[PDB]
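Observation: inputs received (chain + chloride ion).
Thought: call the complex predictor directly.
Action: predict_structure
Action Input:
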Amino acid sequence: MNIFEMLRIDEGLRLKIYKDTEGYYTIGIGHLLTKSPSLNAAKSELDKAIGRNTNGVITKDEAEKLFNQDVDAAVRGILRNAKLKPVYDSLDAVRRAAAINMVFQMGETGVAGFTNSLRMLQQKRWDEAAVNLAKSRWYNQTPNRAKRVITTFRTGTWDAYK
Ligand SMILES: [Ar]
Ligand SMILES: [Ar]
Ligand SMILES: [Ar]
Ligand SMILES: [Cl-]
Ligand SMILES: [Cl-]
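Observation:
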């Protein structure tokens, strides 16, 4: 298992514009297109993203390409964030994939706000971090996914995904 297969499991794959768990227009493997309620706006950002008139539908390859760019951007965002980088650098490989997943889902900014959990992670206090991480809107809104990521930080193994 790896970051890609993990996020492919948490996100699914949809080839037509859809709304995500928050009601926002998305496509592919969790590629958010826009926070705007306008379908046209969403279709416009899609065409710009792909480089053609897609009419709201893309192929599997195009979806995978967007996903690769998104995973890459997520990692780079972590490495550029002064609050996240040190945490991430202290982690083992499995736990780093858990940190990437969160950032992918909620943004760098979002993640940078779990101050207390970040410090527990940095300190390798797994169980405590896990309890703190669950005290969040993130966990109350998407609890099955949050539990998989949390267990991943807790144990350092992929069992939640097997
Ligand atoms: Ar992190
Ligand atoms: Ar994180
Ligand atoms: Ar975190
Ligand atoms: Cl893009
Ligand atoms: Cl969920």
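Thought: report the result.
Final Answer: The chain has one domain: 1-162. The pocket of chloride ion (ligand 4) is lined by residues 49 (CB under 6 Å).
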